[PDB]
């Protein structure tokens, strides 16, 4: 009785766009397996040693077959959640590192950006050079567009 959790409605919003459709297929197969597990019981149907015994001519045979079934063993499956666990942990590692690194770096960058945004030079107290640096796009192109005033006819 084990099943670990994803908010599937939201969980669809975690995968990179690589095969999120295949991810949806996996989730659907998961719901399918949930229904299937719901279907069958966990344990076997029982067996009647003495009941079927008195019921059958194979009476002591019924008891002995109950004993044999107690001896008889069906093969239990095998698990590989360890590989899944390693994949999950390594992915947590990689993704968290990349996020807390690049996102934080861009956070600092855009933080400086917001600071400078609050740091708008007054227009009259903004030199032509003030804007030219601030808006590098006004660059003279004074080689690509040298000819004073160094800009396109527009």
């Amino acid at each position: 009785l084990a099943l670990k959790t994803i908010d599937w409605v939201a969980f669809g919003e975690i995968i990179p766009r690589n095969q999120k459709a295949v991810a949806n297929s996996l989730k659907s197969w998961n719901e399918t397996l949930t229904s299937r597990l719901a279907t069958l019981p966990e344990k076997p149907p029982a067996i009647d040693w003495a009941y079927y015994k008195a019921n059958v001519a194979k009476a002591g045979l019924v008891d002995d077959f109950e004993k044999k079934f107690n001896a008889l063993k069906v093969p239990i499956p095998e698990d590989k959640y360890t590989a899944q666990v390693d994949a999950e942990e390594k992915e947590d590692v990689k993704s968290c590192a990349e996020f807390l690194t690049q996102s934080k770096t861009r956070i600092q960058e855009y933080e400086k950006e917001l600071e400078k945004m609050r740091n708008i030079i007054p227009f009259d107290q903004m030199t032509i050079e003030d804007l030219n640096e601030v808006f590098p796009e006004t660059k003279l192109d004074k080689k690509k567009y040298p000819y004073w005033p160094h800009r396109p006819i527009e």
Binding site: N30, P41, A46
Partner: protein, 54 residues
């Protein structure tokens, strides 16, 4: 800035998905075990019938 924050949040929360993958594997194994149980049950019942009916 908001975008970086949100991307961080989502990529972080993603691990519930790996939890669900573990769910899938665990359910597969549990169903295999339960089915083996029930199959043994049915085989035993068939054997028991094979004599009472005769």
């Amino acid at each position: 800035i908001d975008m970086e924050k949100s991307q961080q949040a989502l990529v972080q929360k993603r691990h519930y998905l790996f939890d669900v993958q573990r769910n899938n594997i665990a359910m597969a194994l549990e169903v295999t075990y339960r089915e083996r149980l029930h199959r043994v049950y049915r085989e035993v019942k068939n054997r028991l019938d094979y004599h009472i009916s005769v």
